[PDB]
Amino acid sequence: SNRPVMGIVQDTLTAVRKFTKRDVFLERGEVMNLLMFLSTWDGKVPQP
Amino acid sequence: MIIPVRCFTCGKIVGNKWEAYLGLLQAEYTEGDALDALGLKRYCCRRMLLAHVDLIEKLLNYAP
Amino acid sequence: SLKQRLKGKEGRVRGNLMGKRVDFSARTVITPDPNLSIDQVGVPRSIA
Amino acid sequence: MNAPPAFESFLLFEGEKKITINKDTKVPNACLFTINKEDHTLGNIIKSQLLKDPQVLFAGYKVPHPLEHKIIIRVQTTPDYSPQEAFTNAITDLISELSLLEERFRVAIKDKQEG
Amino acid sequence: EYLRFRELPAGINSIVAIASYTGYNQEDSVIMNRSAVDRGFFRSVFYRSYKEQESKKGFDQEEVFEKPTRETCQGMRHAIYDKLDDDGLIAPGVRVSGDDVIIGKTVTLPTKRDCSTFLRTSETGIVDQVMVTLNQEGYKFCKIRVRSVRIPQIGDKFASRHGQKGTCGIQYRQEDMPFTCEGITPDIIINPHAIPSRMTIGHLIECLQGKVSANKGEIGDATPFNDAVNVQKISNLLSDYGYHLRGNEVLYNGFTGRKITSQIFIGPTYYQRLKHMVDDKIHSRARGPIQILNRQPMEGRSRDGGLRFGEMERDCQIAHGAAQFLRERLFEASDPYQV
Amino acid sequence: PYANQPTVRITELTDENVKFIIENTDLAVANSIRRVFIAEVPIIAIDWVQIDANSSVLHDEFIAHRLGLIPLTSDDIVDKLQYSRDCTCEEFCPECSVEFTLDVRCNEDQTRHVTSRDLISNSPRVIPVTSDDILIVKLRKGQELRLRAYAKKGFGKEHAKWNPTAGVAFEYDPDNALRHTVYPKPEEWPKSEYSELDEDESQAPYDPNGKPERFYYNVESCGSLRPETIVLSALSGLKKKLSDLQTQLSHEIQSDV
Amino acid sequence: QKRITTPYMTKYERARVLGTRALQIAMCAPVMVELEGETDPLLIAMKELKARKIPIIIRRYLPDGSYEDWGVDELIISD
Amino acid sequence: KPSDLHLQTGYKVERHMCDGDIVIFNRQPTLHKMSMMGHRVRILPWST
Amino acid sequence: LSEKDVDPVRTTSNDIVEIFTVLGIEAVRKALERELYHVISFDGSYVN
Amino acid sequence: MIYICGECHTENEIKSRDPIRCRECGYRIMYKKRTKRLVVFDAR
Amino acid sequence: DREVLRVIFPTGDSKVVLPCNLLRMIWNAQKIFHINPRLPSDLHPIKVVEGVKELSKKLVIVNGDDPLSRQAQENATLLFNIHLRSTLCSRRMAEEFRLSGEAFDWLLGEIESKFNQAIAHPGEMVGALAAQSLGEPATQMTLNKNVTLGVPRLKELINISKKPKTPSLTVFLLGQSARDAERA
Ligand SMILES: [Zn+2]
Ligand SMILES: [Zn+2]
Ligand SMILES: [Zn+2]
């Protein structure tokens, strides 16, 4: 069906919807924790 | 089978409370009152005694 | 008879030529691991 | 059948380093600290103590896998400050806080016990 | 009351939190409390009995119980025959592992072949009982019970009483588990995503009623068609014990100690450990024995058989275009032959 | 030099629990403290059982499981005792373990309750906490239990039997001023025992600059250690882990250069 | 010359060329590319494929019975 | 005996499956192409 | 189809055999595609 | 080779040749006695 | 091309399946080369016309210069070429996309590169692919005016049967009968 066969499912899908809401704000410490789990991260913290 | 030594959730000792719990029930205590009398405040520990089945008593009926 | 041996799902052709039991294969229960990559499989040491 | 020994989560097997330091090539003044047989206990306090250092730009830790017993701590400091120096100062600050906490808890016990 | 379920229960009341904690309970998986398991939570015994009979039938052929010496007896295996007692029977209280001989049986050769009983490869237990008697045929008859203790592992099946089965995906210690302000950690964490599609609302009501039962000290009544019991009534009772009326509690992350933003539905639920344990299903094959007729890997886990690479698996590899791997599975790894 | 300056207030101190408040700490330090109460406070527990006779209805390792969970007095002897892995002796010795004996025969018609009071230690400093008594097994007439056990040092990170706590209540921001938890209907939620709010309001006003600074504890003791000893042992043990870590870090820094 | 088949290497040719070359390397065949700290025969074959140094000719059989011989260097690798 | 344990070129060592080993990992019924996919082996300490 | 006031261009039968014997092999090729497409796409599923 | 009778609980020495049967009550179900070898249980 | 499309899609459904996503490729070019939609473009309209003509020759499905090969090549890429022409037209390249010369040259390269990657690979077991592609959906089909559908209908199509379970005949009225219920 010329489309992906696997996607984001269950927790990650339910959480990514909450995560990308307009009113989700992360503190400096919270952000640095998440970037630890980003294998492709360039090591540069973006401007908040 | 036998009263677990510790509460599964928090690790409080409950294996010294089964006989006391039975005695309190013999004294017309309600189950909730008997658990309170024994100091089991967290409902995890109350679960241990309130739901225990003492099958070891049945097993002692069979001759060794 | 000979005819019975060759026909059917469990017959000689379908059961032993089109499909067959193989060496170097393992089977066990599967559990989630969000810390693996999509292209990784966590394997017990006993199977390895 | 495949159950690891319970002690394997806090005991180092022979030839295992408790902590190793690896420079982070992506950005300057960044090092990765791989600590063996440690969990969120030390990872969280070290990370939170580092975030209190104004010269630390990035502080973060992770347990790469719960079945493994490693914590990776990533520290990035300012050019005039070393990640290793930040790490040592963070532990001394934690040790000072814990030692002070021990002394003040002992006094509290004595006051409570006395009356 | 009439099923005698109280007298012979088949489960444990578990503090169950319905939460997405670390992703290890997704897709009908379960997070278990390692500390609770260390305290006997869902610990079980597996008893397996082996029966062996020595029968003499034939002009000079007979079977006896004895320790088969590698020289005297023809048949032999790489197992260990040292555990056997002089009478060919292992003794109670002896630890036995895979490839161990529990019954030493020798059949006189027309010197003598070995028909000794080998303990199941996966099984690793302790000989519990060794019963010897005469069977219905009058021949000497031995039954040996091997006792193995099964501590809940990752991969063991657990179900509530509402069709919500799931294997254990990971076990966290008490400090790693999320806790309430009272220090209560869940024994089991199930994913919230198991509830919506399945619509096992009775699971949520049992958890709410279980919380009231444990706090009140009364066994709750969940008889189906009972107007005297409503969710609102149960919720009102729960409020009287200092809990949120809907069974939610503020939980703290065990790794960081921070309050979780969402309050977690947590309470006692009766779970049951299912017979299906991973250690009874894990099976690995790497050049095992082959069957006589087809000269292909044997069948069955107990026979160290190979997994079937069936037509569907073959059709799949054709679509992949992996001609060589298809040749490995269907020729090289099954029955390579020359004519 | 950015160390915190924590203050301690002990609210309640009994033989079973210690209730205290820590102020001016980070949440990570407060959480690591409770997390050490449970997993890294050493005590002495039975970890080696050798059963000579067991005619009871409970199989051998059923009994051994209970023996391990029986709390033993560990208040001061635990510090003296060495870890059997660290000790240079054979399997066991008095400097790394405590020997226990249990020899009960039932010959009366009345059921015989084998309790922790029937466990006899070779060292008076390490005894079952109950000496009601914890029930190990019930014996029928003609049944006996004869075993010897060795209790060794350990902490909860290995097995829950070395966890000295019976529940560590931990709390902060009882009025939810930081909004670390968002209540869909705050009016529906019971007030915390440490809540300083009036009956009319359910939440403290949001504090944009607030941080978790005050933490409430209720460390209940299984009995192996006094509740105040668990806290002190945790604080020194957590400090030991950090000091041990820094020694390794010093070598690694020196080795690289 | 006079080739009608695609100038690109197919995914099936890449899979077999790499697998076949890896076995040759694993059997002590000379490595056409310069390797630095590479010991896996399959990774070495990948370097040769990228360098277009695999000494293998792919013979593509056409339905009519004829074939076209392509050098691995001639074909366009997907990467 | 180490003499028989001495390796020389052309020998094959049937070594244990290790991290990064490529395996085919299948769930039945095998209905389409994604029912059998290749995975890199990661060794983890349990039986699933 | 031969009936008056009946469109002989769009009037179609869902019976594949009827199409073959009336319209030919190419018509049934198209009709077979449409009928198979109907069952696949009936529930919104898409196949290339 | 001591055998405990399944009914009267009497230890009986039976060789590999003599029939298996209680000396006292003649019961036909025997049980091997617990091995003298002592197994070590971790109390976990 | 517009009239050819009307024949191919009489229903007027413009949704098609084609190799290269031209609209996203243009979007990528705008971001890569920082195209400013407000400013006038430096891309000559003729370069668009000539560039697309050159691109069409590079996208070859049926190679060969003989008339039979040329016609098949024209037919094989007819739909894509129509889509390519109606997207990379000079009017639109200057009116909404506003691509520059550098961006357009990159765009032509991407279409060629992505189109060649879309060509079916010799040795592809497309029959097995089709069987699984039409069989996997069957595992989610239901079983049973009313017309047979789902698995039971799929069987009738592949088990071609003299007597279908629910034979039917869709009749379309030709003259005034179509628009008059009484006459229908
Ligand atoms: Zn409890
Ligand atoms: Zn010692
Ligand atoms: Zn007898």
Asked if I2 and I11 count as a contact pair (C-beta separation under 8 A), the reply is no
Residues of chain F in contact with residue E245, where contact means CB-CB under 8 angstroms, are 188
Contact F39 D41 (CB under 8 A): yes
Terminal-residue alpha carbon distance, chain D: 56
What is the count of structural domains for chain F? 2
Q: Give the DSSP letter string of D43-108.
A: HHHHHHHHHT-TTEEEEEEE-S-TTS-EEEEEEEE-TTS-HHHHHHHHHHHHHHHHHHHHHHHHHH
Query: 């389409």: which residue's tokens?
Result: H32
Cα(C21)–Cα(E337) distance, rounded to whole angstroms?
Answer: 15
Q: Do chains C and H touch (3 or more CB pairs under 8 A)?
A: yes
Q: What is the 3-state secondary structure (H, E, C) of chain E?
A: CCCCCCCCCCCEEEEEEECCCCCCCCCCCEEEEHHHHHCCCCCEEEEEEEEEECCCCCCCCCEEECCCCCCCECCCCCCECCCCCCCCECCCCCEECCCEEEECEEEECCCEEECCEECCCCCCEEEEEEEEEECCCCCEEEEEEEEEEECCCCCCEEECCCCCEEEEEEEECCCCCCEECCCCCCCEEECCCHHHHHCCHHHHHHHHHHHHHHHHCCCCCCCCCCCCCCHHHHHHHHHCCCCCCCCEECEECCCCCCECCCCEEEEEEEEEECCCCHHHCCEEECCCCECCCCCCECCCCCCCCCEEECHHHHHHHHHHCCHHHHHHHHHHCCCCCCC
Q: What is the 3-state secondary structure (H, E, C) of chain J?
A: CEEEECCCCCEEECCCCCCCCCCCCCCCCEEECCCCCCCEECCC
Q: Which residues contact E191 (CB under 8 A, 6 or more apart)?
A: A10, A11, E18, E20, E25, E26, E27, E28, E29
Residues preceding gaps in chain G (C to N > 2.5 Å): none
**Tokens representing residue E320 in the block:** 């992949």
Amino acid (one-letter) located at J13: E
Measuring CA to CA, how many Å separate F219 from each of E181, F40, F134, F167? 12, 14, 22, 7
> In chain A, whose CA is at the least distance from the CA of D74?
A36
Q: Please list the helix, strand and coil fractions of chain K in percent, rounded to the nearest 5, in that order.
A: 55, 0, 45
**Tokens representing residue G51 in the block:** 């360098």
Cα(K93)–Cα(K38) distance, rounded to whole angstroms?
Answer: 13
At K117, phi and psi to the nearest 5? Answer: -65, -25
Q: What is the CA radius of gyration of chain H?
A: 17
Amino acid (one-letter) located at F186: P
Contact E23 A12 (CB under 8 A): yes
Domain spans in chain G, listed from the N-terminal domain onward: 1-79
Residues of chain A in contact with residue I47, where contact means CB-CB under 8 angstroms, are 1
Cα(K150)–Cα(K128) distance, rounded to whole angstroms?
Answer: 21
> Cα B15–B17–B23 angle (5° rounding)?
140
Can you give the length of chain B in residues? 64
Can you give the length of chain G in residues? 79
Please tell me the distance between residue F82's alpha carbon and the centre of ligand 2 in angstroms: 7
Shortest distance between the Cα of E221 and any Cα of chain B, in A, equals: 14
Among residues E27, I9, I27, D18, the alpha carbon closest in space to that of F243 is found at D18
**Tokens representing residue B8 in the block:** 């599964």
Asked if E92 and J34 count as a contact pair (C-beta separation under 8 A), the reply is yes
Q: What is the DSSP letter of B51?
A: T
**Tokens representing residue K150 in the block:** 């789902």
What number of CA atoms fall less than 13 Å from residue F59's CA on the CB side? 20
Asked if F3 and D96 count as a contact pair (C-beta separation under 8 A), the reply is yes
> In chain C, whose CA is at the least distance from the CA of A37?
C35
Q: What is the largest CA-CA distance in chain K?
A: 68
Amino acid (one-letter) located at C24: F
Which of F143, F160, F177 is the C-terminal boundary of a domain? F160
Which of F12, F135, F159 would best serve as a mutation to test chain B binding (most B beta carbons within 10 A)? F135
Q: Does D72 touch chain F (CB under 8 A)?
A: no
Contact H47 E310 (CB under 8 A): no
- Domain B1-64: give its CATH code: 1.10.10.60
Contact E322 G15 (CB under 8 A): yes
Cα(D72)–Cα(D70) distance, rounded to whole angstroms?
Answer: 7
Which is catalytic among the residues E28, E85, E87, E280? E28
Q: Are residues F105 and F181 in the same domain?
A: no
**Tokens representing residue F131 in the block:** 């000496």
| Angstrom resolution of this structure | 3.0
The response to whether J13 counts as a known ligand-binding position is no
Cα(A23)–Cα(A42) distance, rounded to whole angstroms?
Answer: 26
Q: Which residues contact A47 (CB under 8 A, 6 or more apart)?
A: none
Asked if E155 and E31 count as a contact pair (C-beta separation under 8 A), the reply is no
What number of CA atoms fall less than 13 Å from residue E103's CA on the CB side? 28
* Among candidates H31, H33, H46 on the partner chain, residue whose Cβ is nearest the Cβ of E153: H46
Asked if H20 and H26 count as a contact pair (C-beta separation under 8 A), the reply is no
Cα(C40)–Cα(H43) distance, rounded to whole angstroms?
Answer: 10
The b/e string for E185-220 (b: 16+ C-beta within 10 A; e otherwise) is: bbbbbbbbbbbeeeebeebbbbbbbbbbbbbbbeeb
Name all domains of chain J by residue range, CATH numbers in brackets: 1-44 (2.20.28.30)
Question: How many CB atoms are located within 10 Å of the residue B51 CB?
Answer: 18
Q: Does I40 touch chain K (CB under 8 A)?
A: yes
Shortest distance between the Cα of H45 and any Cα of chain D, in A, equals: 6
Measuring CA to CA, how many Å separate B62 from each of F52, F106, J7? 22, 15, 12
Q: Which residues contact F247 (CB under 8 A, 6 or more apart)?
A: none
Cα(E110)–Cα(E322) distance, rounded to whole angstroms?
Answer: 52
**Beta carbon pairs, C and D, within 8 Å:** 8
Amino acid (one-letter) located at E213: S
Among residues A8, A16, C31, the alpha carbon closest in space to that of E25 is found at C31
Q: Counting Cβ atoms within 10 Å, is residue D104 exposed (0-12), middle (13-18) or buried (19+)?
A: middle
In sign, the C-alpha dihedral spanning B40, B46, B50, B55 is negative
Cα(A45)–Cα(E328) distance, rounded to whole angstroms?
Answer: 50
**Tokens representing residue D109 in the block:** 């016990």
Among residues F46, D103, E312, the alpha carbon closest in space to that of J41 is found at F46
Helix (H, G, I), strand (E, B) or coil at G14: helix
What number of CA atoms fall less than 13 Å from residue F73's CA on the CB side? 16
Helix (H, G, I), strand (E, B) or coil at I17: helix
**Beta carbon pairs, C and H, within 8 Å:** 48
Cα(H35)–Cα(A6) distance, rounded to whole angstroms?
Answer: 12
Residues of chain D in contact with residue F39, where contact means CB-CB under 8 angstroms, are 41
Asked if G73 and G52 count as a contact pair (C-beta separation under 8 A), the reply is yes
Contact D74 A37 (CB under 8 A): no
Among residues K179, K151, K175, the alpha carbon closest in space to that of K165 is found at K151
Helix (H, G, I), strand (E, B) or coil at K134: helix
Cα(E233)–Cα(E228) distance, rounded to whole angstroms?
Answer: 9
Question: How many CB atoms are located within 10 Å of the residue G49 CB?
Answer: 22
User: How would you classify the pairing of strands F135-139 and G57-61?
Assistant: unpaired
Cis bond before residue G41 (omega within 30° of 0): no
Cα(G44)–Cα(E178) distance, rounded to whole angstroms?
Answer: 48
Strand order in the sheet with F120-121: F120-121, F97-105, F144-154, F43-54, J40-41
Measuring CA to CA, how many Å separate A48 from each of A25, E325, F60, K141? 10, 51, 62, 49
Q: What is the 3-state secondary structure (H, E, C) of F123-159?
A: CCCCCECCCCCCEEEEECCCCEEEEEEEEEEECCCCC
Q: Are residues F57 and F121 in the same domain?
A: yes
Q: Are residues F106 and F173 in the same domain?
A: no
Q: Which residues contact I19 (CB under 8 A, 6 or more apart)?
A: I12, I13, I27, I28, I31
Question: How many CB atoms are located within 10 Å of the residue E118 CB?
Answer: 15
The b/e string for H13-47 (b: 16+ C-beta within 10 A; e otherwise) is: eeeebeeebebbebeeebbbbebbbebebbbbebb
Helix (H, G, I), strand (E, B) or coil at K57: helix
Ligand nearest the Cα atom of residue J5:
3
Q: Does C32 touch chain D (CB under 8 A)?
A: no
* Beta-bridge partner residues of E273: E158
Helix (H, G, I), strand (E, B) or coil at K136: coil
Query: 């950090």: which residue's tokens?
Result: F242
What method was applied to determine this entry?
cryo-EM
Amino acid (one-letter) located at E161: R
Cα(F88)–Cα(F98) distance, rounded to whole angstroms?
Answer: 16
What is the count of structural domains for chain D? 1
Q: Please list the helix, strand and coil fractions of chain B in percent, rounded to the nearest 5, in that order.
A: 45, 5, 55
Q: Are residues F57 and F154 in the same domain?
A: yes
Q: Which residues contact F197 (CB under 8 A, 6 or more apart)?
A: F175, F191, F203, F204
Asked if F102 and F148 count as a contact pair (C-beta separation under 8 A), the reply is yes
Cα(E121)–Cα(C40) distance, rounded to whole angstroms?
Answer: 29
Which of F103, F129, F160 is the C-terminal boundary of a domain? F160
Residues of chain J in contact with residue E66, where contact means CB-CB under 8 angstroms, are 16
Cα(F150)–Cα(F96) distance, rounded to whole angstroms?
Answer: 10
**Tokens representing residue F85 in the block:** 């892995």
CATH number for the domain that contains residue F18: 3.30.1360.10
Cα(K184)–Cα(K178) distance, rounded to whole angstroms?
Answer: 6
Q: Are residues F50 and F35 in the same domain?
A: no
> In chain E, whose CA is at the least distance from the CA of A24?
E261
Contact J29 E65 (CB under 8 A): no
Measuring CA to CA, how many Å separate E138 from each of A30, E63, E135, G36, J28? 76, 14, 5, 76, 11
Asked if F30 and F212 count as a contact pair (C-beta separation under 8 A), the reply is yes
Cα(F81)–Cα(F132) distance, rounded to whole angstroms?
Answer: 28
Range of the domain at F246: 1-42+161-257
In sign, the C-alpha dihedral spanning F245, F248, F250, F253 is negative
CATH number for the domain that contains residue D108: 3.30.1360.10
Helix (H, G, I), strand (E, B) or coil at F181: coil
Asked if F37 and F18 count as a contact pair (C-beta separation under 8 A), the reply is no
Interface of C with A in 1-48 (CB under 8 A): 34, 38
Cα(D107)–Cα(D113) distance, rounded to whole angstroms?
Answer: 10
The b/e string for K19-51 (b: 16+ C-beta within 10 A; e otherwise) is: bbebeebbeebbeebebeeeeebebeeebbeeb
**Tokens representing residue F243 in the block:** 């000091």
Can you give the length of chain C in residues? 48
Please tell me the distance between residue D76's alpha carbon and the centre of ligand 1 in angstroms: 43
**Tokens representing residue F170 in the block:** 């931990």
> Annotated catalytic, E28?
yes
Can you give the length of chain D in residues? 115
* Among candidates F1, F36, F157 on the partner chain, residue whose Cβ is nearest the Cβ of D93: F1
Residues of chain E in contact with residue F62, where contact means CB-CB under 8 angstroms, are 45, 149
| DSSP-H helix ranges across chain F | 27-39, 60-69, 77-80, 227-256
Can you give the length of chain A in residues? 48
**Tokens representing residue F57 in the block:** 């209805």
Question: How many CB atoms are located within 10 Å of the residue I23 CB?
Answer: 16
Cα(D30)–Cα(B57) distance, rounded to whole angstroms?
Answer: 65
Amino acid (one-letter) located at K122: P
* Beta-bridge partner residues of E63: E107
Asked if C11 and C5 count as a contact pair (C-beta separation under 8 A), the reply is yes
Measuring CA to CA, how many Å separate F213 from each of F7, F25, F238, I24, J10? 10, 5, 20, 85, 71
Q: Which parts of B are annotated binding residues for Zn(2+)?
A: 7, 10, 44-45
CB < 8 Å & 24+ apart, contacts of A6-12: A6/C38, A6/H34, A9/E26, A9/E27, A10/E26, A10/E27, A10/E191, A10/E193, A11/C34, A11/E20, A11/E23, A11/E26, A11/E191, A11/E193, A12/C34, A12/E23
Q: What is the DSSP letter of G1?
A: -
Question: How many CB atoms are located within 10 Å of the residue G46 CB?
Answer: 18
Cα(J4)–Cα(J31) distance, rounded to whole angstroms?
Answer: 5
Q: What is the DSSP letter of F190?
A: P
Q: Does E262 touch chain F (CB under 8 A)?
A: yes
* H or E element in which residue B60 lies: none
Cα(C27)–Cα(E43) distance, rounded to whole angstroms?
Answer: 25
* Among candidates C21, C23, C34 on the partner chain, residue whose Cβ is nearest the Cβ of E299: C21
Among residues E193, E186, E191, E192, the alpha carbon closest in space to that of E172 is found at E186
Q: What is the largest CA-CA distance in chain C?
A: 54
What number of CA atoms fall less than 13 Å from residue D74's CA on the CB side? 26
Asked if D90 and D50 count as a contact pair (C-beta separation under 8 A), the reply is yes
Contact F143 B64 (CB under 8 A): yes
- Domain G1-79: give its CATH code: 3.90.940.10
**Tokens representing residue K134 in the block:** 């039409």
The b/e string for E285-322 (b: 16+ C-beta within 10 A; e otherwise) is: beeeebeeeeebbbeebeebbbbbbbebbbbbbbbbbb
Residues of chain D in contact with residue F15, where contact means CB-CB under 8 angstroms, are none
Q: Are residues F52 and F25 in the same domain?
A: no
Which of F130, F160, F190 is the C-terminal boundary of a domain? F160
Cα(G18)–Cα(F45) distance, rounded to whole angstroms?
Answer: 59
User: How would you classify the pairing of strands F144-154 and F120-121?
Assistant: unpaired
Residues of chain K in contact with residue E316, where contact means CB-CB under 8 angstroms, are 132
